[PDB]
Design a protein around this ligand. Sequence first.
Ligand SMILES: *[C@@H]1O[C@H](CO)[C@@H](O[C@@H]2O[C@H](CO)[C@@H](O[C@@H]3O[C@H](CO[C@H]4O[C@H](CO[C@H]5O[C@H](CO)[C@@H](O)[C@H](O)[C@@H]5O[C@H]5O[C@H](CO)[C@@H](O)[C@H](O)[C@@H]5O)[C@@H](O)[C@H](O[C@H]5O[C@H](CO)[C@@H](O)[C@H](O)[C@@H]5O)[C@@H]4O)[C@@H](O)[C@H](O[C@H]4O[C@H](CO)[C@@H](O)[C@H](O)[C@@H]4O[C@H]4O[C@H](CO)[C@@H](O)[C@H](O)[C@@H]4O)[C@@H]3O)[C@H](O)[C@H]2NC(C)=O)[C@H](O)[C@H]1NC(C)=O
Ligand SMILES: *[C@@H]1O[C@H](CO)[C@@H](O[C@@H]2O[C@H](CO)[C@@H](O)[C@H](O)[C@H]2NC(C)=O)[C@H](O)[C@H]1NC(C)=O
Ligand SMILES: O=C[C@H](O)[C@@H](O)[C@@H](CO)O[C@@H]1OC[C@@H](O[C@@H]2OC[C@@H](O)[C@H](O)[C@H]2O)[C@H](O)[C@H]1O
Ligand SMILES: O=C[C@H](O)[C@@H](O)[C@@H](CO)O[C@@H]1OC[C@@H](O[C@@H]2OC[C@@H](O)[C@H](O)[C@H]2O)[C@H](O)[C@H]1O
Ligand SMILES: O[C@@H]1[C@@H](O)[C@H](O[C@@H]2CO[C@@H](O)[C@H](O)[C@H]2O)OC[C@H]1O
Ligand SMILES: O[C@@H]1[C@@H](O)[C@H](O[C@@H]2CO[C@@H](O)[C@H](O)[C@H]2O)OC[C@H]1O
Lengths: 449, 455
Amino acid sequence: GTTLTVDLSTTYQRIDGFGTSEAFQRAVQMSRLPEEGQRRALDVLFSTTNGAGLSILRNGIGSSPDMSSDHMVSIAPKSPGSPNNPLIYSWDGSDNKQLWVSQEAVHTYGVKTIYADAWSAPGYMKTNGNDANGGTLCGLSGAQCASGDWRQAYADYLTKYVEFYQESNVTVTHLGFINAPELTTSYASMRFSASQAAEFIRILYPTIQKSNLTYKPTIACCDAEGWNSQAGMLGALSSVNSMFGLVTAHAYTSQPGFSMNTPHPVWMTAAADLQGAWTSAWYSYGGAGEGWTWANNVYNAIVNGNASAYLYWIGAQTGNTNSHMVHIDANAGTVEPSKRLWALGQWSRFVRPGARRVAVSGASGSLRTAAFRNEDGSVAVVVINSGGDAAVNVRLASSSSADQQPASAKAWATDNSRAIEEIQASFADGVATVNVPSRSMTTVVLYPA
Amino acid sequence: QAGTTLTVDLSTTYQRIDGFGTSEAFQRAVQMSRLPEEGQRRALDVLFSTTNGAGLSILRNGIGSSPDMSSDHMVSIAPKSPGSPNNPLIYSWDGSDNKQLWVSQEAVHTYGVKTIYADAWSAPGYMKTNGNDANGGTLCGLSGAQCASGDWRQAYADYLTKYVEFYQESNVTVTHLGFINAPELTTSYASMRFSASQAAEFIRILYPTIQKSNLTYKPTIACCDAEGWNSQAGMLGALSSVNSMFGLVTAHAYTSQPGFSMNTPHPVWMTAAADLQGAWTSAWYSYGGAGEGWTWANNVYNAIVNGNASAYLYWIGAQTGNTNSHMVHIDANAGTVEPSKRLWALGQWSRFVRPGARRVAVSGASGSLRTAAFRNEDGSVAVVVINSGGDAAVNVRLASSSSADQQPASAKAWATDNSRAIEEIQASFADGVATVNVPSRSMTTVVLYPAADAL
Ligand SMILES: *[C@@H]1O[C@H](CO)[C@@H](O[C@@H]2O[C@H](CO)[C@@H](O[C@@H]3O[C@H](CO[C@H]4O[C@H](CO[C@H]5O[C@H](CO)[C@@H](O)[C@H](O)[C@@H]5O[C@H]5O[C@H](CO)[C@@H](O)[C@H](O)[C@@H]5O)[C@@H](O)[C@H](O[C@H]5O[C@H](CO)[C@@H](O)[C@H](O)[C@@H]5O)[C@@H]4O)[C@@H](O)[C@H](O[C@H]4O[C@H](CO)[C@@H](O)[C@H](O)[C@@H]4O[C@H]4O[C@H](CO)[C@@H](O)[C@H](O)[C@@H]4O)[C@@H]3O)[C@H](O)[C@H]2NC(C)=O)[C@H](O)[C@H]1NC(C)=O
Ligand SMILES: *[C@@H]1O[C@H](CO)[C@@H](O[C@@H]2O[C@H](CO)[C@@H](O)[C@H](O)[C@H]2NC(C)=O)[C@H](O)[C@H]1NC(C)=O
Ligand SMILES: O=C[C@H](O)[C@@H](O)[C@@H](CO)O[C@@H]1OC[C@@H](O[C@@H]2OC[C@@H](O)[C@H](O)[C@H]2O)[C@H](O)[C@H]1O
Ligand SMILES: O=C[C@H](O)[C@@H](O)[C@@H](CO)O[C@@H]1OC[C@@H](O[C@@H]2OC[C@@H](O)[C@H](O)[C@H]2O)[C@H](O)[C@H]1O
Ligand SMILES: O[C@@H]1[C@@H](O)[C@H](O[C@@H]2CO[C@@H](O)[C@H](O)[C@H]2O)OC[C@H]1O
Ligand SMILES: O[C@@H]1[C@@H](O)[C@H](O[C@@H]2CO[C@@H](O)[C@H](O)[C@H]2O)OC[C@H]1O
């Protein structure tokens, strides 16, 4: 059959993980389910044995005065009157139900990567006096305010949000201070040029470093709405590459189809079929909402976009568009996972944080392949099969060390009939033989003893 | 103060008490079986008799993991590997289970025990990363434990189910089932290392295996018999995803004490404690030392009132040897059995606080008295009085708020102390109030009985 030979001596990017968000009170929607529904939603998102095994949670650092509509209330919703005054913190022990989701992810399911991102400063820190409708942080170049220079205050505020999480037994590992900085919206939004982002990183970095935080989070930038948009910010960011450690971008205004010129890992932090009528299907005709489509979208972001992580926009939510992976039926108190959840899971269950992408060769026409060596030495080989059932042999290169060689193998597939379902893996003399199902994503894993 | 009045408020309730007990694992049951017939009967009586012994209501058995009965090892029902987990397991039943089946049959059919907790300390060696039931190692096929020989997770679930079926076919119902013991500890004897995450992983496999089995009674899954409260409490977060698939939290009292309530929806049992290394003593009170009956009466109190425990098991019941690892001493040469006052301390609880009792509020204790109260399923109310002072005149009553048909029509009392082993004392009863002289340095239990069916 087809023989796929993994070359562990040819390496690419590290994989930090896969995930999603419950921002904008999507966590509050989850919190209103019955106990059994809450548990099923958390399980299908985070379970490493019986769900998607998502390894990254992205939270919003709320900017709004209250929890009206779907707004994320800020930890400091009321102005202290001057940026020279201590901020007025009113920690509610909830953070828009994101603290609960985070505690479950970390303490119940073993998630270790928590990305907190502000879509805006509080309104009193901004040129327009409002967390919505754009505007900029007071005190940046070209943004003087009568009320004062709020740059250090905003750095102190973000540091305090991370401290509140720490005191609630959750370590925020990555910290963002803008989202879609190129776009004014009717909801939480804030306009920074790439230059202003560099200016603010020079203030935020020493604030974190001098803080009493147990773990100093890595600063991220800038959650632009597409690859091209974020790539256009990298020149101005290059002066501060010693002071941040993660580039973030979405997949809306352009696709993750090229390697960005940055020394940092690059995460694709939001993608979705936002407008698409709800479908739970794996494959029907290759539509934009189909699980098969999203298995390939992830492949493309990793192999062509050089992404180290891939986050779907929203995990569990109500509504009937493909903006989310897991449908909440608030009436029945029920939870329905789409095959998009299982697409992201077919990746995340087997390609764990700290994996290194490695060369695989031998694929035929109708197979797209990628390989990853996990920190534990397990070698996950992804096979996306656009044809009929295919006999595939998976092995390491001749030149592989005996300590890298597998003593056992397993395989799982997602297709129309399967949700990360274990399939037979014949194992003889370092070689795993699997029948990759028609129109499936199959992951074959080679385990050392 | 016409004595100290203890007033029970039946409207204020706490946890249920499932019972009190011990184990005869690691061939301690074999040591009992070697006694002359009268010695066997005396050992069984002092453990289980509800009239003339400690009335222990729970037995904890080991699910043997060893390839043979060398040393004190518990031989497995499946000591020989089938080579591969695709192959049916090879069951080699000996009709004995390291003499635990006999102790169980006597407990259930002679003495009325209804709760039988079977716990594996290891899978058989051939199912593990180290190929041995001792020296730790992990079940093959769990996350972080892939084995050349295969994935033995389903096999181990099938094996545990089959152990329960062999008991069922020998007319004993296993009510509770554990699959690890001290999962944080590697030892030179039966031992197996699981993280809390691995335990949750295995529960997701074991639960449906039990539910689809042909067992007459589906036992409740327990976890995880950690060596202390702190160690077990640290496992609860990873276990919380499978709270719909198990029903009992278990922990020991070695590496920390049962001094706080665990955050779990399940009943919590303290399934092993002992003065393991203390020189044998049979005494109730000498100075408050680690082996004394008085100290163990207080350890039970603390586990129930401060630990929120629903059950309390001493490590071993009857055993040979010269330490306080056990409650009842066997002299294999004399063929004799000698209960310590630790046996009588646990019986001073278990005789009167029967399975299903609900802990209830009691007020009025003076400085020398520690008190707790329990409403039994039959409406009888057991009031424990632990008295560190001289003889204490005490009155025991229900709160005036009580329905007149909850109010006792009779009362009895028993005490354990340096001279008494669960000995009846006077409970003078007038107009719903029991009056007792609680002896110096004793544990006394006063029971208020409603009239019930009696004219
Ligand atoms: C000290 O230790 C105590 C334990 O020893 C501990 O007590 C525990 O307290 C918590 C918190 O108060 C209690 O949690 C509540 O539980 C309610 C359900 O309780 C009933 O079901 C339980 C589980 O039953 C399963 O397991 C048993 C054995 O495994 C079986 O006997 C059962 O058949 C059943 O098995 C089935 O299900 C299993 C999975 O669960 C499955 O594996 C199995 O195969 C099978 O299919 C019982 O244990 C419990 O029994 C108690 O109560 C009965 C009746 O009084 C007694 O007779 C018993 O002796 C025993 O004491 C019950 O039968 C939940 O409903 C409740 O959740 C609701 O409320 C919360 C908020 O508190 C809401 O967030 C939630 O959404 C729920 O809301 C619903 O109900 C409310 C009504 O109040 C309503 O307003 C709302 O709209 C909605 O409808 C909560 O989870 C827990 O039960 C206690 N345990 C026990 C054993 O009592 C105590 O806290 C400790 N103290 C301290 C200080 O820490
Ligand atoms: C893909 O992304 C990785 C980062 O995830 C890039 O790795 C960097 O490569 C440069 C140039 O060789 C090194 O000096 C950096 O130290 C690397 N960063 C890390 C964190 O490893 C890699 O260059 C990217 N690939 C392409 C084709 O652009
Ligand atoms: O510029 C026009 C484009 O269509 C954008 O609006 C798209 C792609 O860049 O942007 C996306 O719009 C929808 C956003 O979702 C919402 O977030 C706020 C919340 O209150 C709403 O309920 C959501 O619909 C998404 O964040 C954004 O990337
Ligand atoms: O880590 C060191 C500690 O002292 C542990 O050894 C203690 C308390 O955690 O653990 C206890 O050690 C003795 C064990 O009893 C033995 O069980 C196996 C049997 O073969 C032996 O004869 C017994 O001594 C006890 O189970 C354990 O809790
Ligand atoms: O490894 C396999 C798991 O991936 C599988 O998980 C299931 C995925 O589909 C969901 O609908 C189920 O709830 C979940 O259990 O279970 C089998 C296991 O071998
Ligand atoms: O109710 C009382 C029993 O608890 C008591 O049991 C005795 C306890 O001490 C043991 O040494 C004896 O063998 C045992 O009979 O017996 C008297 C009864 O009133």
